[PDB]
């Protein structure tokens, strides 16, 4: 028998960059007594860079 040596995994292209810049590069923040809520979906979150 021949045993395999390497192990490769390929996945589709990554292009769903989540809109997280505007959240942290925001011109204004809402007042604490009336906080603003934002929901996101269908995006890939780069938790690492944050």
């Amino acid at each position: 028998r021949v045993q395999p040596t390497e192990s490769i995994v390929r996945f589709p292209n990554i292009t769903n960059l989540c809109p997280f810049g505007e959240v942290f590069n925001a011109t204004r923040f809402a007042s604490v007594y009336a906080w603003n809520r934002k929901r996101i979906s269908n995006c890939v979150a780069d938790y690492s860079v944050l």
Binding site: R1, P4, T5, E6, S7, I8, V9, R10, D46
Partner: protein, 98 residues
């Protein structure tokens, strides 16, 4: 987190691609082992995987370059030995199967 289908996921890390060397693989969740090489038959531009009469995986499209690849196992072969009889001499020869 609910029972609805998920929408947000972490960035999956994509590895490299190698051929002509029997190695483990995993494409889009499809796992297995074999030898990777090009083919000639062309899928329709909405299909992945690829089967045979024995309904086992036979081809796959690499989901970054959009090209056809072929698969082949590498675990054949039984070991056999030829002996002229230990009564006379000890030199032997080895025969593999396939």
């Amino acid at each position: 987190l609910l029972h609805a289908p998920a929408t947000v996921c972490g960035p999956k890390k994509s590895t490299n691609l190698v051929k002509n060397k029997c190695v483990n693989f995993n494409f889009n969740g499809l796992t297995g082992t074999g030898v990777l090489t090009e083919s000639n038959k062309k899928f329709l531009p909405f299909q992945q995987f690829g089967r045979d009469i024995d309904d086992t995986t036979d081809a796959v499209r690499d989901p970054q370059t959009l090209e056809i690849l072929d698969i082949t196992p590498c675990s054949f072969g039984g070991v056999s030995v030829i002996t002229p009889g230990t009564n006379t001499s000890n030199q032997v020869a080895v025969l593999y199967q396939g």
